[PDB]
Amino acid sequence: APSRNGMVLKPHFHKDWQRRVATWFNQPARKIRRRKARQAKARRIAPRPASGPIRPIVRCPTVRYHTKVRAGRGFSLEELRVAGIHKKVARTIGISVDPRRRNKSTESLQANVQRLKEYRSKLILFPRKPSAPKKGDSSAEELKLATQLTGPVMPVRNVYKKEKARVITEEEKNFKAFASLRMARANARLFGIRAKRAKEAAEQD
Amino acid sequence: AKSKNHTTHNQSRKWHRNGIKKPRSQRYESLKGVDPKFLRNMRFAKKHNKKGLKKMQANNAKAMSARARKLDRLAYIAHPKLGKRARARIAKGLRLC
Amino acid sequence: PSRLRKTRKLRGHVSHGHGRIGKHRKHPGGRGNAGGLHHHRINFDKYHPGYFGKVGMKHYHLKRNQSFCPTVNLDKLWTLVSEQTRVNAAKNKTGAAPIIDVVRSGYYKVLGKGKLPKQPVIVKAKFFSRRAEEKIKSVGGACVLVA
RNA sequence: GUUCACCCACUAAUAGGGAACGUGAGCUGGGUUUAGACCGUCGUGAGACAGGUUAGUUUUACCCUACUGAUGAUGUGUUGU
RNA sequence: CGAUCCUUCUGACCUUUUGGGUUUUAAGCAGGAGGUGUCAGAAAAGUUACCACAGGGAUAACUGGCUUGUGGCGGCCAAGC
RNA sequence: CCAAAUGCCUCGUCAUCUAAUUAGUGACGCGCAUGAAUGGAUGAACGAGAUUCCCACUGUCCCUACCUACUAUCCAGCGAAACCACAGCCAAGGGAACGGGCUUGGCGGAAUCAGCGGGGAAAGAAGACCCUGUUGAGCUUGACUCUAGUCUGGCACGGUGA
RNA sequence: GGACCAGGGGAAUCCGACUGUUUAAUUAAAACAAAGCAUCGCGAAGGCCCGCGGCGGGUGUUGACGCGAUGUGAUUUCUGC
RNA sequence: CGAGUAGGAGGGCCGCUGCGGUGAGCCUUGAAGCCUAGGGCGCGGGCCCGGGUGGAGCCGCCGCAGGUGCAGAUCUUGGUGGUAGUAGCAAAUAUUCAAACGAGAACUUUGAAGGCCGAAGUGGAGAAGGGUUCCAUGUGAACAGCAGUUGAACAUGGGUC
RNA sequence: CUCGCUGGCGUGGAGCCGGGGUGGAAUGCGAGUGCCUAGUGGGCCACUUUUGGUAAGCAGAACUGGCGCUGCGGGAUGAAC
RNA sequence: AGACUAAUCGAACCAUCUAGUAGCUGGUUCCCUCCGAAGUUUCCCUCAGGAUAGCUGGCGCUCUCGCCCACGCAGUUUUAU
RNA sequence: ACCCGACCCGUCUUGAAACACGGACCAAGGAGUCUAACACGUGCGCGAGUCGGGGGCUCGCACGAAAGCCGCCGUGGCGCAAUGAAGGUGAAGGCCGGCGCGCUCGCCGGCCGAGGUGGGAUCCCGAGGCCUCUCCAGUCCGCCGAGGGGCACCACCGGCCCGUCUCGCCCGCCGCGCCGGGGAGGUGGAGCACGAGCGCACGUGUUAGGACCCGAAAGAUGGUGAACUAUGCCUGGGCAGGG
RNA sequence: GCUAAAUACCGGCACGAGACCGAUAGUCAACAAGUACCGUAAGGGAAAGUUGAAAAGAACUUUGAAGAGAGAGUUCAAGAG
Ligand SMILES: [Mg+2]
Ligand SMILES: [Mg+2]
Ligand SMILES: [Mg+2]
Ligand SMILES: [Mg+2]
Ligand SMILES: [Mg+2]
Ligand SMILES: [Mg+2]
Ligand SMILES: [Mg+2]
Ligand SMILES: [Mg+2]
Ligand SMILES: [Mg+2]
Ligand SMILES: [Mg+2]
Ligand SMILES: [Mg+2]
Ligand SMILES: [Mg+2]
Ligand SMILES: [Mg+2]
Ligand SMILES: [Mg+2]
Ligand SMILES: [Mg+2]
Ligand SMILES: [Mg+2]
Ligand SMILES: [Mg+2]
Ligand SMILES: [Mg+2]
Ligand SMILES: [Mg+2]
Ligand SMILES: [Mg+2]
Ligand SMILES: [Mg+2]
Ligand SMILES: [Mg+2]
Ligand SMILES: [Mg+2]
Ligand SMILES: [Mg+2]
Ligand SMILES: [Mg+2]
Ligand SMILES: [Mg+2]
Ligand SMILES: [Mg+2]
Ligand SMILES: [Mg+2]
Ligand SMILES: [Mg+2]
Ligand SMILES: [Mg+2]
Ligand SMILES: [Mg+2]
Ligand SMILES: [Mg+2]
Ligand SMILES: [Mg+2]
Ligand SMILES: [Mg+2]
Ligand SMILES: [Mg+2]
Ligand SMILES: [Mg+2]
Ligand SMILES: [Mg+2]
Ligand SMILES: [Mg+2]
Ligand SMILES: [Mg+2]
Ligand SMILES: [Mg+2]
Ligand SMILES: [Mg+2]
Ligand SMILES: [Mg+2]
Ligand SMILES: [Mg+2]
Ligand SMILES: [Mg+2]
Ligand SMILES: [Mg+2]
Ligand SMILES: [Mg+2]
Ligand SMILES: [Mg+2]
Ligand SMILES: [Mg+2]
Ligand SMILES: [Mg+2]
Ligand SMILES: [Mg+2]
Ligand SMILES: [Mg+2]
Ligand SMILES: [Mg+2]
Ligand SMILES: [Mg+2]
Ligand SMILES: [Mg+2]
Ligand SMILES: [Mg+2]
Ligand SMILES: [Mg+2]
Ligand SMILES: [Mg+2]
Ligand SMILES: [Mg+2]
Ligand SMILES: [Mg+2]
Ligand SMILES: [Mg+2]
Ligand SMILES: [Mg+2]
Ligand SMILES: [Mg+2]
Ligand SMILES: [Mg+2]
Ligand SMILES: [Mg+2]
Ligand SMILES: [Mg+2]
Ligand SMILES: [Mg+2]
Ligand SMILES: [Mg+2]
Ligand SMILES: [Mg+2]
Ligand SMILES: [Mg+2]
Ligand SMILES: [Mg+2]
Ligand SMILES: [Mg+2]
Ligand SMILES: [Mg+2]
Ligand SMILES: [Mg+2]
Ligand SMILES: [Mg+2]
Ligand SMILES: [Mg+2]
Ligand SMILES: [Mg+2]
Ligand SMILES: [Mg+2]
Ligand SMILES: [Mg+2]
Ligand SMILES: [Mg+2]
Ligand SMILES: [Mg+2]
Ligand SMILES: [Mg+2]
Ligand SMILES: [Mg+2]
Ligand SMILES: [Mg+2]
Ligand SMILES: [Mg+2]
Ligand SMILES: [Mg+2]
Ligand SMILES: [Mg+2]
Ligand SMILES: [Mg+2]
Ligand SMILES: [Mg+2]
Ligand SMILES: [Mg+2]
Ligand SMILES: [Mg+2]
Ligand SMILES: [Mg+2]
Ligand SMILES: [Mg+2]
Ligand SMILES: [Mg+2]
Ligand SMILES: [Mg+2]
Ligand SMILES: [Mg+2]
Ligand SMILES: [Mg+2]
């Protein structure tokens, strides 16, 4: 079968694929199902925003993506506890709750507490009975719009650094190096044996 | 299943369709397959052409450069450029009585 | 377009462009990659050299995920910033320099070419290469690692 | 089964041949050469054996041609001798 | 005189053993072997007359044709009878 | 026990049957390759079994003839089908080597009936022989790879007492 | 026997004891069976077999004068190494 | 300068069918088809024109899209021939004369003669299976391999305690 | 001039730089170069040269042309003369 | 007897998987203009097939000839060897 | 009517009027398709970039199952960077000087910054003469010897990165170590030498898909048949005369 | 141990759309189609659309017994009976 110069092609068509093929001609219909599903979700609720649970702020776990940031799933129980509010109180406020999430980094941890202080500043709620506890006055006709768009706070807003200008100094262009990667990379590979070779040097005696 | 085995009948006629193309001419013959010790002399000889000589050789070029009659007759009548006085006598020529 | 074909030209002709004598049948030399080692070695070798055999160590659960470092060379190095800054780094000031960060644009390792801009710089990267690090020391610039 | 071959008798003589080794929609089906089977040799074996013996469906012409036989057929007006 | 895959052995005070280590085992890089004699490298017995299908006059047994050794028929020379 | 339903050479050789017998029968045995439950050899009765001979019989034949019954034949009536390139007079020629067409010649008249079977390499089936196929199926063993069962080993149920 | 109705006969050789059966649609045979003669397994928690399964089944409403497995094929005379 | 199998390209104002565009296109005052000793054009694929039939839709040009162009496959399905008024209507002995009804009689009905099945029947009754075939009347286009004034046919109506 | 090779020799030999003269047999022609790829992968005959054969309208080749793929005029007719 | 098992037997019938596979047979639908071959090499369980070259087509590209001597090329000679 | 020419078409084939095969005759049906993927070629858009292909926004307007928008939806795909089994490393030289024995020898300071040679379309400079008396003068057209900077590209040299091999030398110390780095050569690389892709469309081509149509002998799965026949089994029936 | 979402739907209940097919096409089925009819059965499984605007579907006259016709009529047309 093969011939003059061409690439080896191995397609996966020995398996009788024509019985099992999903065809996307139902693609405009579901798209109109789903706008009319979100808009049916829009006019049920009330003043509360669609996509209304607020999400936390989470850095992306790898070496590849950890220089960007992402709306996670739920505020940490210990994050949310620094704001001081109880668990199932908080979901009625409209905050997402996640028990699985730790907090190793207080720069991460306090950044979400600032976000909850933001949202609880942001919040205009309504009571059942106007006994005036954590409630709102006649407030900007339900604050000028009932519903928000794509999260309440624009969760990405990925923060950039300027560090605008500086003079270059002595002893940085004198000392820094390529080689202080290579010296340190080779330092890490030999920490085990350099510990042991000197340990059996003094164990010899 | 008996067959014919080998024949160069009609192979002379196929080869000379496009023709026996002779490579024969090109310049600066390729420099692979050379005796390596010879090449381990010559690459060094090239790299000191550049570095070793400016002032000796270029000025040395500067020194040596500072050291340095009837049928013959009508063609001249009927030439395209050399005959306009040939017409001095048929056009505005001297002939007259 | 079935109106631009070869089929629509070849009607009226008998064998439809596949030969009386050889008779295009079904699958003469097998299906697919049949007989690579046996009767198609003059095709597989001389067109796909090295298709058969093994070379290396196995690596289980290879993620494309601990080897992620998009490179850059010193041609494109000025192209991350608006070139407003390289004018205002050439504005006769002092050894003040833009701190170009390649980690922002996505580039981890800075490889090298020749011919970098004369004006002094500070590059903040995760990885450097020593030819490129010889180039930034040429212009009097600096070389800062980020971790 | 014979092609072949010898054999007794007659006779002028019992010459040799060819026509898809004439001739099977002319026949006969003896043997070769389907399935049954027995013997012998070979094979561990199923099976094999120009080795031997026996039992085993031989189709259709009304077409065209050829031939044989049967009427007729174009011209001398008609028809008869 | 002999490829891939496999095996076996040797070589660096070599690379990787998967969260970081220490060691055993294993995986690799390089060059020597253990084979494919159908020898550019399949892992391999037999019968079919109970047979079957795809086909071939590319390939036999019958005719016909070319050839005429062999068979058959004659001719020239003359040692002899 | 024999040229056998088994003997290649082989129509073995002799003897009997015949005017004449590759047949039959009897005999002879280094019997190509007989033979003992692979059953050897006999033998009455029996046979839609095989082979030969004699007597009687007769159209099997010499050597054909004749009559009858039904068809065929002709007419009244109702009436298919196989098949079929167009078609069909022969000799030689070359030709894919054995033509209805081509070439050179022989020649050649409407349309048909009843016979006949020389030709149409006639019709009837994509050759059952043979060969190729990297196509099969039934069978077989000391083919290769396996497996039902079965034979033993070990563990579990599986304890008490000397 | 006046039509109908109805055994040609002997002399023998080969094969098979005979009667029976069989290849529906190419064969009635000498082929198969057959009584006779042998040989072997097994005393039942067993022989031979079925079974996808259980100590389910058939032989077994049985018991060595029986079941199961084969060769040979009446009789007479024989059964070598 | 021109050959051409296998083959590859190019041009097609060649044809068919469907879609946007355009033709102030076309037509019950006759569209499609189809036929045509009618007039032509093109090398050709194919087209335009007249006449005749029919009676309701159709074609150009620029683009777009094909399940798009037949002599063949022991082609599939449909249809008709030559063979052809030919084979053929030949198993088991058989008809005859007259009469009636009837458009119409070698066969239907009656009557007489001549016959055969010959009691293991061409007879008298059932089990199985057939399911209205049984009976009566009525017609004669089918069907009954000729015919029919007949029937186990068609049509109507009855009957199985 | 260079050389790290050669070496009695400023020598061997390559390499590099600059300068100086186009005209070096006949003949005919416009050449050079890259991509993709169908078809093919059963051949045959003839002058001369040839191997196996007794010989072949046989089997195997070399050189060239042809039939194939190709009509037309001649060989009565024909694939190749 | 390899028989019979619903005109089916050396493994029934029916439907699906199944439009199974095939290097093997048969067919492959409009015109015109241009160009136009191969049966050979090597290897293949290769010998009725492919792979690869050769041969063919197409699409381009880079240039030169338009004006006492051109550039380049070759199934050819000539002159040397 | 007649002269001359004139074998029946497809098919395999070295060859067909073939004593080779299929073809009685007409009408309709009827056979290289579509999806994926790769490759070259070509049109178009953008250009070190490109791509909405998946989502969201538009009011829910017949055609709308369309179209338009996003850009803090460019995540990603493909490309810009390679090489190595892997740890990993990852592509600038040229010019004028200086320091050491200026050597098989490396370093120090400026100045442009992708080398060189042969070829090389086009372009530029062109001596030189060319057009009615003559001088005397600038535009001017065309020819132009020779010279010049030279594109695309090909042939060759040098260099650079990585993997490797031989050779020997010097240095740096996030801490003195079988630690990091450098040199000169020789070879392995799908690379570097001022990038050309990407997205759609069309062609031709190969491959897997029923895959140009039609074709087997079979293989398995799961089912219906003892109304014929093979044989048992229960229950019934039948057989004249004579030796 | 339980739990909506977005996801899937060639059966079923309604429904709109089609660069589709237009009776040998499309489902096998535009029609008294899973029906006529074959097989005991498992199962297999066809064909068959078209008067006209409206029935105005040809009263009556006339041969034959009637089928079948000649006159007549209805219709734009019986060249739609
Ligand atoms: Mg190919
Ligand atoms: Mg499959
Ligand atoms: Mg060959
Ligand atoms: Mg062709
Ligand atoms: Mg071939
Ligand atoms: Mg082919
Ligand atoms: Mg592969
Ligand atoms: Mg004969
Ligand atoms: Mg015989
Ligand atoms: Mg015989
Ligand atoms: Mg036999
Ligand atoms: Mg033996
Ligand atoms: Mg007989
Ligand atoms: Mg005739
Ligand atoms: Mg691990
Ligand atoms: Mg070999
Ligand atoms: Mg076998
Ligand atoms: Mg042949
Ligand atoms: Mg002789
Ligand atoms: Mg006799
Ligand atoms: Mg013996
Ligand atoms: Mg013996
Ligand atoms: Mg014994
Ligand atoms: Mg003749
Ligand atoms: Mg002849
Ligand atoms: Mg001949
Ligand atoms: Mg002859
Ligand atoms: Mg003939
Ligand atoms: Mg003639
Ligand atoms: Mg006759
Ligand atoms: Mg006859
Ligand atoms: Mg014949
Ligand atoms: Mg015949
Ligand atoms: Mg055949
Ligand atoms: Mg083979
Ligand atoms: Mg197979
Ligand atoms: Mg005896
Ligand atoms: Mg008997
Ligand atoms: Mg019989
Ligand atoms: Mg006995
Ligand atoms: Mg038991
Ligand atoms: Mg005794
Ligand atoms: Mg031409
Ligand atoms: Mg038109
Ligand atoms: Mg038209
Ligand atoms: Mg269509
Ligand atoms: Mg089609
Ligand atoms: Mg054709
Ligand atoms: Mg046909
Ligand atoms: Mg007929
Ligand atoms: Mg007759
Ligand atoms: Mg007759
Ligand atoms: Mg009367
Ligand atoms: Mg009457
Ligand atoms: Mg009687
Ligand atoms: Mg009776
Ligand atoms: Mg009655
Ligand atoms: Mg009546
Ligand atoms: Mg009748
Ligand atoms: Mg009735
Ligand atoms: Mg092609
Ligand atoms: Mg090829
Ligand atoms: Mg020859
Ligand atoms: Mg050919
Ligand atoms: Mg030619
Ligand atoms: Mg010729
Ligand atoms: Mg001629
Ligand atoms: Mg002659
Ligand atoms: Mg001829
Ligand atoms: Mg048998
Ligand atoms: Mg049967
Ligand atoms: Mg069988
Ligand atoms: Mg098919
Ligand atoms: Mg299917
Ligand atoms: Mg099939
Ligand atoms: Mg040509
Ligand atoms: Mg071959
Ligand atoms: Mg063939
Ligand atoms: Mg070409
Ligand atoms: Mg032909
Ligand atoms: Mg034949
Ligand atoms: Mg034929
Ligand atoms: Mg025929
Ligand atoms: Mg058609
Ligand atoms: Mg492209
Ligand atoms: Mg991105
Ligand atoms: Mg199999
Ligand atoms: Mg089966
Ligand atoms: Mg089964
Ligand atoms: Mg019964
Ligand atoms: Mg759980
Ligand atoms: Mg119709
Ligand atoms: Mg249908
Ligand atoms: Mg109507
Ligand atoms: Mg009347
Ligand atoms: Mg009308």
Swiss-Prot record, chain A:
It comes from the Eukaryota. The modification Phosphoserine is found at residues 51, 76, 105. It is found in: Cytoplasm. There is a cross-link at residues 122, 144, 173, 176 (Glycyl lysine isopeptide (Lys-Gly) (interchain with G-Cter in SUMO2)). Component of the ribosome, a large ribonucleoprotein complex responsible for the synthesis of proteins in the cell. The small ribosomal subunit (SSU) binds messenger RNAs (mRNAs) and translates the encoded message by selecting cognate aminoacyl-transfer RNA (tRNA) molecules. The large subunit (LSU) contains the ribosomal catalytic site termed the peptidyl transferase center (PTC), which catalyzes the formation of peptide bonds, thereby polymerizing the amino acids delivered by tRNAs into a polypeptide chain. Component of the 60S large ribosomal subunit (LSU). GO terms for molecular function: RNA binding; structural constituent of ribosome. This is Large ribosomal subunit protein eL13. The lineage of its organism: Eukaryota, Metazoa, Chordata, Craniata, Vertebrata. There is a cross-link at residue 173 (Glycyl lysine isopeptide (Lys-Gly) (interchain with G-Cter in SUMO1)). The modification N6-acetyllysine is found at residues 15, 176. One of its GO terms (cellular component) is nucleus. Higher levels of expression in benign breast lesions than in carcinomas. One of its GO terms (biological process) is blastocyst development. Keywords: Acetylation, Cytoplasm, Disease variant, Dwarfism, Isopeptide bond, Phosphoprotein, Ribonucleoprotein, Ribosomal protein, Ubl conjugation. Belongs to the eukaryotic ribosomal protein eL13 family.
Swiss-Prot record, chain B:
The keyword Ligase does not apply. It comes from the Eukaryota. The keyword Ribonucleoprotein applies. Transmembrane segments: none annotated. Residues 1-31 are annotated as: Disordered. Belongs to the eukaryotic ribosomal protein eL29 family. Component of the large ribosomal subunit. Component of the large ribosomal subunit. The ribosome is a large ribonucleoprotein complex responsible for the synthesis of proteins in the cell. This is Large ribosomal subunit protein eL29. The chain holds residues 2 to 119 of 159 of the full protein. One of its GO terms (biological process) is embryo implantation. One of its GO terms (molecular function) is RNA binding. Keywords: Acetylation, Cytoplasm, Heparin-binding, Methylation, Phosphoprotein, Repeat, Ribonucleoprotein, Ribosomal protein. The modification N6-acetyllysine is found at residue 32.
Swiss-Prot record, chain C:
The modification N6-acetyllysine is found at residues 46, 54, 109. Component of the large ribosomal subunit. The ribosome is a large ribonucleoprotein complex responsible for the synthesis of proteins in the cell. It comes from Homo sapiens. PANTHER family: 60S RIBOSOMAL PROTEIN L27A, LARGE RIBOSOMAL SUBUNIT PROTEIN UL15. It is found in: Cytoplasm. It comes from the Eukaryota. Residues 1-29 have a biased composition (Basic residues). Residues 1-37 are annotated as: Disordered. GO terms for molecular function: RNA binding; structural constituent of ribosome. Belongs to the universal ribosomal protein uL15 family. Component of the large ribosomal subunit. This is Large ribosomal subunit protein uL15. HAMAP family: Ribosomal_uL15.
